[PDB]
């Protein structure tokens, strides 16, 4: 689940159209819900909410805003990995 989020987060920073940003966020969201099932759970409601915020911008046709709005997702995701590896 974390490997899907990180791999597709490079696609957003590389894609240059609303067709590939929306598609990448769809896989990123599908894993975010999947990872949540397995405070830690409340840490994903913020992340999925930020995917909705980025996916809504990329749906309106603003690819440039989506890549700018997906940067804030990188810090939140990196915090969960640091918090999870400490717990395990």
């Amino acid at each position: 689940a974390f490997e899907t989020l990180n791999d597709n987060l490079k696609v957003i920073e590389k894609a240059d159209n609303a067709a590939q940003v929306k598609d990448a966020l769809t896989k990123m969201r599908a894993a975010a819900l999947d990872a949540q099932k397995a405070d830690f759970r409340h840490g994903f409601d913020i992340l999925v909410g930020q995917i909705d915020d980025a996916l809504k911008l990329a749906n309106e046709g603003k690819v440039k805003e989506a890549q700018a709005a997906a940067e804030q997702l990188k810090t939140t995701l990196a915090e969960l990995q640091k918090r999870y590896w400490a717990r395990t």
Partner: antibody
Amino acid sequence: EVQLVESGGGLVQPGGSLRLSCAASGFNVVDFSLHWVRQAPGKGLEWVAYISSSSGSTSYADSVKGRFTISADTSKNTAYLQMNSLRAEDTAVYYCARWGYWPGEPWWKAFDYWGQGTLVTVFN
Amino acid sequence: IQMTQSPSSLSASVGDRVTITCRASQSVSSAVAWYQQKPGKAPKLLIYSASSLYSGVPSRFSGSRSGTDFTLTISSLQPEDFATYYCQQYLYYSLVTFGQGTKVEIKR
């Protein structure tokens, strides 16, 4: 009791305009996005359009974008679907769905409550 | 995405067990729902999140998931369970695609 009722379906000339309204009772539209799904007579369900009145977003199916224009009215607690340039493939029964807001359980509920459905037929 | 549902028409007598298979085109995590459309009426939700039972339906309905392959299993049919069952995925608000549709018929 939560219920949704539609109106406005009826005979329309091809290329004409028809307006479908989904009067919502027992809840507030601001707390639940309203979706429209149509069923061609004797076929499977298909998605049409949705409006999230809290955020103002709106999307349409690939086969309908550019013709339909869905709007919501919180004061009257209804959601209107304006249909323009109807063709022969738009004859169906249009259901008005409901769907919770992420996050939490209500998002997982999917289309828990459905409308009665109004028949829209294009006629020569 | 695309959602294939089989069998498209099956027959089973009262008291028999029915398995309906739905297979997504790509991974949809656990976003699958099953509806039951009686002839001439609006569909009703039966299973949501692909495994949970919606409150208000008899307990005989059950769901399952194996990777990207889903299944709706009826433990024991009754004369009130003869209708069309549709398989839906709801991965995102704008990517909703329904299955073809399985119809259950009386066997004689």
